[PDB]
Write a protein that holds these residues in place. Structure first.
Motif, PDB file in Angstrom:
ATOM      1  N   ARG A  27       0.823  -1.204   0.000  1.00 35.49           N
ATOM      2  CA  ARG A  27       0.000   0.000   0.000  1.00 35.49           C
ATOM      3  C   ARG A  27       0.861   1.260   0.000  1.00 35.49           C
ATOM      4  O   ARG A  27       2.043   1.219   0.355  1.00 35.49           O
ATOM      5  CB  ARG A  27      -1.003  -0.017   1.163  1.00 35.49           C
ATOM      6  CG  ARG A  27      -2.046  -1.135   1.005  1.00 35.49           C
ATOM      7  CD  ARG A  27      -3.280  -0.961   1.877  1.00 35.49           C
ATOM      8  NE  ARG A  27      -4.096   0.197   1.504  1.00 35.49           N
ATOM      9  CZ  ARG A  27      -4.990   0.209   0.517  1.00 35.49           C
ATOM     10  NH1 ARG A  27      -5.187  -0.868  -0.236  1.00 35.49           N
ATOM     11  NH2 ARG A  27      -5.682   1.311   0.272  1.00 35.49           N
ATOM     12  N   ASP A  78     -17.804   2.717  -4.093  1.00 33.21           N
ATOM     13  CA  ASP A  78     -18.765   1.936  -4.866  1.00 33.21           C
ATOM     14  C   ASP A  78     -20.181   2.034  -4.309  1.00 33.21           C
ATOM     15  O   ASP A  78     -21.146   2.256  -5.052  1.00 33.21           O
ATOM     16  CB  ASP A  78     -18.347   0.463  -4.853  1.00 33.21           C
ATOM     17  CG  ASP A  78     -17.285   0.141  -5.894  1.00 33.21           C
ATOM     18  OD1 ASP A  78     -16.769   1.083  -6.538  1.00 33.21           O
ATOM     19  OD2 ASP A  78     -16.968  -1.062  -6.064  1.00 33.21           O
ATOM     20  N   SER A 104      -9.391   6.379  -3.365  1.00 37.43           N
ATOM     21  CA  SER A 104      -9.434   6.483  -1.911  1.00 37.43           C
ATOM     22  C   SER A 104      -8.644   7.697  -1.428  1.00 37.43           C
ATOM     23  O   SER A 104      -9.005   8.317  -0.432  1.00 37.43           O
ATOM     24  CB  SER A 104      -8.855   5.220  -1.270  1.00 37.43           C
ATOM     25  OG  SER A 104      -7.458   5.121  -1.517  1.00 37.43           O
ATOM     26  N   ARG A 140     -10.744  10.601  -1.153  1.00 34.77           N
ATOM     27  CA  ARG A 140     -11.674  10.446  -0.035  1.00 34.77           C
ATOM     28  C   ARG A 140     -10.999  10.662   1.320  1.00 34.77           C
ATOM     29  O   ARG A 140     -11.662  10.580   2.356  1.00 34.77           O
ATOM     30  CB  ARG A 140     -12.350   9.076  -0.066  1.00 34.77           C
ATOM     31  CG  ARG A 140     -13.149   8.820  -1.332  1.00 34.77           C
ATOM     32  CD  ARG A 140     -14.203   7.747  -1.113  1.00 34.77           C
ATOM     33  NE  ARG A 140     -13.647   6.508  -0.566  1.00 34.77           N
ATOM     34  CZ  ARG A 140     -13.245   5.480  -1.307  1.00 34.77           C
ATOM     35  NH1 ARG A 140     -13.330   5.543  -2.633  1.00 34.77           N
ATOM     36  NH2 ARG A 140     -12.760   4.388  -0.729  1.00 34.77           N
ATOM     37  N   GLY A 176     -15.619   7.408  -5.997  1.00 35.47           N
ATOM     38  CA  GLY A 176     -16.381   6.416  -5.261  1.00 35.47           C
ATOM     39  C   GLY A 176     -16.775   6.964  -3.903  1.00 35.47           C
ATOM     40  O   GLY A 176     -16.905   8.176  -3.740  1.00 35.47           O
ATOM     41  N   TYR A 194     -17.359   9.757 -10.189  1.00 34.23           N
ATOM     42  CA  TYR A 194     -17.453   8.300 -10.313  1.00 34.23           C
ATOM     43  C   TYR A 194     -16.199   7.601  -9.822  1.00 34.23           C
ATOM     44  O   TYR A 194     -16.280   6.584  -9.132  1.00 34.23           O
ATOM     45  CB  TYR A 194     -17.696   7.928 -11.779  1.00 34.23           C
ATOM     46  CG  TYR A 194     -17.857   6.443 -12.067  1.00 34.23           C
ATOM     47  CD1 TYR A 194     -19.084   5.809 -11.906  1.00 34.23           C
ATOM     48  CD2 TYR A 194     -16.791   5.691 -12.551  1.00 34.23           C
ATOM     49  CE1 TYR A 194     -19.240   4.450 -12.196  1.00 34.23           C
ATOM     50  CE2 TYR A 194     -16.936   4.336 -12.842  1.00 34.23           C
ATOM     51  CZ  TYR A 194     -18.162   3.723 -12.662  1.00 34.23           C
ATOM     52  OH  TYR A 194     -18.311   2.380 -12.954  1.00 34.23           O
ATOM     53  N   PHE A 195     -15.040   8.141 -10.199  1.00 40.08           N
ATOM     54  CA  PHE A 195     -13.769   7.498  -9.888  1.00 40.08           C
ATOM     55  C   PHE A 195     -13.265   7.837  -8.486  1.00 40.08           C
ATOM     56  O   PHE A 195     -12.233   7.324  -8.049  1.00 40.08           O
ATOM     57  CB  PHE A 195     -12.718   7.810 -10.968  1.00 40.08           C
ATOM     58  CG  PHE A 195     -12.959   7.082 -12.263  1.00 40.08           C
ATOM     59  CD1 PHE A 195     -12.736   5.711 -12.361  1.00 40.08           C
ATOM     60  CD2 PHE A 195     -13.426   7.758 -13.378  1.00 40.08           C
ATOM     61  CE1 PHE A 195     -12.966   5.027 -13.561  1.00 40.08           C
ATOM     62  CE2 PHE A 195     -13.658   7.083 -14.578  1.00 40.08           C
ATOM     63  CZ  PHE A 195     -13.429   5.716 -14.668  1.00 40.08           C
ATOM     64  N   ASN A 202     -21.500   5.537  -4.792  1.00 32.44           N
ATOM     65  CA  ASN A 202     -21.978   5.652  -6.172  1.00 32.44           C
ATOM     66  C   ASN A 202     -23.353   4.993  -6.331  1.00 32.44           C
ATOM     67  O   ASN A 202     -24.265   5.566  -6.937  1.00 32.44           O
ATOM     68  CB  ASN A 202     -20.977   5.040  -7.167  1.00 32.44           C
ATOM     69  CG  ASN A 202     -19.744   5.910  -7.381  1.00 32.44           C
ATOM     70  OD1 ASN A 202     -19.684   7.058  -6.920  1.00 32.44           O
ATOM     71  ND2 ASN A 202     -18.755   5.369  -8.104  1.00 32.44           N
ATOM     72  N   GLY A 261      -4.093   2.104  -2.655  1.00 32.05           N
ATOM     73  CA  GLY A 261      -3.564   0.972  -3.403  1.00 32.05           C
ATOM     74  C   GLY A 261      -2.694   1.423  -4.568  1.00 32.05           C
ATOM     75  O   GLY A 261      -1.691   0.782  -4.911  1.00 32.05           O
TER      76      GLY A 261
HETATM   77  N1  6CF Z   1     -12.822  -2.465 -10.903  1.00 36.18           N
HETATM   78  C1  6CF Z   1     -13.127  -1.064 -10.704  1.00 36.18           C
HETATM   79  C2  6CF Z   1     -12.607  -0.381  -9.558  1.00 36.18           C
HETATM   80  C3  6CF Z   1     -12.933   0.979  -9.409  1.00 36.18           C
HETATM   81  N2  6CF Z   1     -13.740   1.646 -10.350  1.00 36.18           N
HETATM   82  C4  6CF Z   1     -14.078   3.057 -10.164  1.00 36.18           C
HETATM   83  C5  6CF Z   1     -15.353   3.182  -9.383  1.00 36.18           C
HETATM   84  C6  6CF Z   1     -14.849   3.482  -8.005  1.00 36.18           C
HETATM   85  O1  6CF Z   1     -15.711   4.279  -7.295  1.00 36.18           O
HETATM   86  C7  6CF Z   1     -13.540   4.168  -8.242  1.00 36.18           C
HETATM   87  C8  6CF Z   1     -12.522   3.867  -7.163  1.00 36.18           C
HETATM   88  O2  6CF Z   1     -12.568   2.499  -6.882  1.00 36.18           O
HETATM   89  P1  6CF Z   1     -12.406   2.038  -5.396  1.00 36.18           P
HETATM   90  O3  6CF Z   1     -13.527   2.744  -4.579  1.00 36.18           O
HETATM   91  O4  6CF Z   1     -12.522   0.490  -5.329  1.00 36.18           O
HETATM   92  C9  6CF Z   1     -10.761   2.551  -4.784  1.00 36.18           C
HETATM   93  F1  6CF Z   1      -9.830   2.282  -5.706  1.00 36.18           F
HETATM   94  F2  6CF Z   1     -10.779   3.859  -4.552  1.00 36.18           F
HETATM   95  P2  6CF Z   1     -10.426   1.604  -3.238  1.00 36.18           P
HETATM   96  O5  6CF Z   1     -10.215   0.120  -3.648  1.00 36.18           O
HETATM   97  O6  6CF Z   1     -11.642   1.663  -2.273  1.00 36.18           O
HETATM   98  O7  6CF Z   1      -9.155   2.114  -2.482  1.00 36.18           O
HETATM   99  P3  6CF Z   1      -7.744   1.517  -2.803  1.00 36.18           P
HETATM  100  O8  6CF Z   1      -7.260   1.813  -4.197  1.00 36.18           O
HETATM  101  O9  6CF Z   1      -6.682   2.063  -1.888  1.00 36.18           O
HETATM  102  O10 6CF Z   1      -7.658   0.024  -2.674  1.00 36.18           O
HETATM  103  O11 6CF Z   1     -13.073   3.734  -9.481  1.00 36.18           O
HETATM  104  C10 6CF Z   1     -14.233   0.953 -11.448  1.00 36.18           C
HETATM  105  O12 6CF Z   1     -15.026   1.595 -12.368  1.00 36.18           O
HETATM  106  N3  6CF Z   1     -13.915  -0.416 -11.621  1.00 36.18           N
END
Ligand code: 6CF
Ligand code: MN
Ligand code: MN
Ligand code: NA
Ligand code: NA
Length: 325
Positions: free
Chosen positions: A140, A266, A171, A174, A264, A261-262, A269, A180
């Motif tokens: 991470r 999820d 994230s 947020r 999030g 959207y990006f 959204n 990640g």
């Molecule tokens: N397979 C995907 C993944 C994401 N998204 C879009 C839609 C999502 O709202 C947005 C972010 O995905 P997220 O919320 O999962 C994340 F990355 F921010 P989080 O995993 O929680 O944290 P971290 O990276 O530290 O592990 O990208 C998408 O369209 N398809």
DNA sequence: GTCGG
DNA sequence: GCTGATGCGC
DNA sequence: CCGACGGCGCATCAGC
């Protein structure tokens, strides 16, 4: 801590379904179940109690009882001690190796990182970088490093053109203390949907490469770049892990819908979209559009900020940090 | 595997 | 060589 | 009881 044992076994099952059984929907079913159970504020005492939660059904309820009683899942103990299964599942941790390539590697005796390195010639470009940065990619990124990563990208983009707009979402946006990877959203006043610029993303990617920020390319086209980056080292000290970076080039007229959207999450959204519906709007990654009496979606509404989208559906602006759900 | 239509 | 399919990771 | 469950951009393959 609450139900970590259960959420652990669900997660493991999810991974078996995805990587070994190639059943992507059961993968999401187990994960969704793992998520609801993880947010649940009591220690679960029965399968029936878990069944009340959305995403947990008869069979997960059955597995939870088996686990609460005996401490294990017979189905998981068996899976753990099949050589093929655990090898396939492991190989998928390499970026660029999915269920299909993993099963194919294991089919010819290729089961471990060692075997992959011996067999580089069998790997495509993406998979070679995935193998090369295997440990770095599973790590991470502290928020402190995200901030230095952000300074670098924002300034380098500014240097290429002052008109570019760039936003780090995911994230990080947020407010998370660790991410990640880094997901960069990019637009320009010159790029709209209407518009006739096969070099807009490129200019930025080559500038990031020139200052040695981007080190490898996984895939790159006119709208999306996926690659590897690295913070400059001390000139003295421990050099930084290599990190995954994604850069997306989005029409200005769809830019704040994309940021929304990006960012999030999820479930946020999901809830936003549902509320919009109730208000006569359909939101997706690209646009918000008014809905007709017969359900037919009208033209895209003018969006010049994220707040604009909340106004359309009469929601008070939600801070990114308050978008956990 | 779990869900809503 | 061309096109559509499949794999992959978001 | 039934099909939906996310689907897009890019890289590589399969089948001409
Ligand atoms: N397979 C995907 C993944 C994401 N998204 C879009 C839609 C999502 O709202 C947005 C972010 O995905 P997220 O919320 O999962 C994340 F990355 F921010 P989080 O995993 O929680 O944290 P971290 O990276 O530290 O592990 O990208 C998408 O369209 N398809
Ligand atoms: Mn039902
Ligand atoms: Mn069915
Ligand atoms: Na993988
Ligand atoms: Na061929």
């Amino acid at each position: 801590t609450l139900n970590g044992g259960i959420t652990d076994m669900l997660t493991e099952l999810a991974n078996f379904e995805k990587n070994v059984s190639q059943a992507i929907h059961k993968y999401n079913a187990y994960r969704k179940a793992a998520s609801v159970i993880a947010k649940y504020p009591h220690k679960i005492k029965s399968g029936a109690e878990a069944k009340k939660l959305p995403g947990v059904g008869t069979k997960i309820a059955e597995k939870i009882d088996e686990f609460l009683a005996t401490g294990k899942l017979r189905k998981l103990e068996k899976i753990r001690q099949d050589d093929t299964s655990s090898s396939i599942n492991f190989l998928t941790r390499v970026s660029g190796i999915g269920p299909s390539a993993a099963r194919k590697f294991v089919d010819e005796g290729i089961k471990t990182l060692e075997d992959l390195r011996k067999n580089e010639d069998k790997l495509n470009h993406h998979q070679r970088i995935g193998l090369k940065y295997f440990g770095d990619f599973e790590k991470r990124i502290p928020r402190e490093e995200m901030l230095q990563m952000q300074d670098i990208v924002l300034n380098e983009v500014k240097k290429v053109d002052s008109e570019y707009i760039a936003t780090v979402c995911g994230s990080f946006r947020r407010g998370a203390e660790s991410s990640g990877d880094m997901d960069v959203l990019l637009t320009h006043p010159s790029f709209t949907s209407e518009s006739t610029q096969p070099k807009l993303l490129h200019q930025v990617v080559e500038q990031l490469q020139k200052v040695h920020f981007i080190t490898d390319t996984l895939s790159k086209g006119e709208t999306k770049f996926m690659g590897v980056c690295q913070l400059p080292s001390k000139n003295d000290e421990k050099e930084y892990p290599h990190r995954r970076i994604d850069i997306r080039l989005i029409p200005k007229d769809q830019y704040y819908c994309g940021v929304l959207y990006f960012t999030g999450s999820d479930i946020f959204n999901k809830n936003m979209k549902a509320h919009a519906l109730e208000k006569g709007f359909t939101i997706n990654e690209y646009t918000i559009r008014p809905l007709g009496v017969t359900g037919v979606a009208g033209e895209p509404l003018p969006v010049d900020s994220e707040k604009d989208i909340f106004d359309y559906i009469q929601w008070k602006y939600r801070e990114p940090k308050d978008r956990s759900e």
